[PDB]
Each structure stands twice: as structure tokens, then as C-alpha cells.
Structure 1
Amino acid sequence: GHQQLYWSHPRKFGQGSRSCRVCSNRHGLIRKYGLNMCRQCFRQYAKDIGFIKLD
């Protein structure tokens, strides 16, 4: 369709308004500290960001 209905549905909020910054997942997102990453992708990259285990 034309521009009048292709993206006319609002997504200014809600779960569909957020995707993982790595894999664009819409499930298991972590928005704490603006992480915006998939939970699995967080566990994958947590060494790379620097979240490490002490306990």
C-alpha cells in the first residue's frame, strides 16, 4: 500500500516499539541503564561490555 497505511499504525510505545540493539528481538529485552539488548545477547556480550561475576 501507499504511505497512508503502510506504517500508519502507531508504535510510539509498547513492546513492539522496542527491539534488541543486537538481534532486534522483541522478547527478553533489558532496558536498564539503556541496555536495549536481548537477554541472550546480553549473556553473550556481558564480558565485552564488562559486567562480570563476583558472586
Structure 2
Amino acid sequence: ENVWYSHPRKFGKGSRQCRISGSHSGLIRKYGLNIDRQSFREKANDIGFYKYR
């Protein structure tokens, strides 16, 4: 309810939240995924991502 409780957080690592943990650490923004990489490297198989080469 306080008047001043937000910084101008338009960009940077702050505004950029993860889709699972909400981390600001190692965020694959690419393709509009927005995931912290570690989690992706576990869920990727369901996200349709595979490794071949």
C-alpha cells in the first residue's frame, strides 16, 4: 500500500523472470522460452528439444 515500492524495472536481470523458479540467473530468453538453463536441461525433452549433434 506504500507509495514508493518499485524501481524503474523495465529491463535488466530484475524484470526478466524465469517460468519455473523466477531466477535472474542464466536465463535462456531465446525463442521466447524464458527459462533458467538448468531446469530447461531437465524439461527440454518435453519442450520438444532433443540432442543429436
Per the normalisation by structure 1, the TM-score is: 0.87
Output the aligned Cα RMSD.
Answer: 1.2
Structure 1 outlier segments of 4+, above 3 Å: none
Between the two proteins, what is the percent identity of the paired residues? 58
How many residues are matched? 53
Extract unaligned runs of 5+ from structure 2.
none
| Structure that is richer in helix per residue | 1
Question: Who is 2:23 aligned against?
Answer: 25
SS of the aligned residue for 1:19 comes to coil
Alignment partners' CA distance in 2, 1:35 and 1:6: 28
TM-score, with length taken from structure 2: 0.89
Cα distance in 1, alignment partners of residues 39 and 17 from structure 2: 12
Structure 2 Cα separation of the partners of residues 16 and 54 of structure 1 = 34
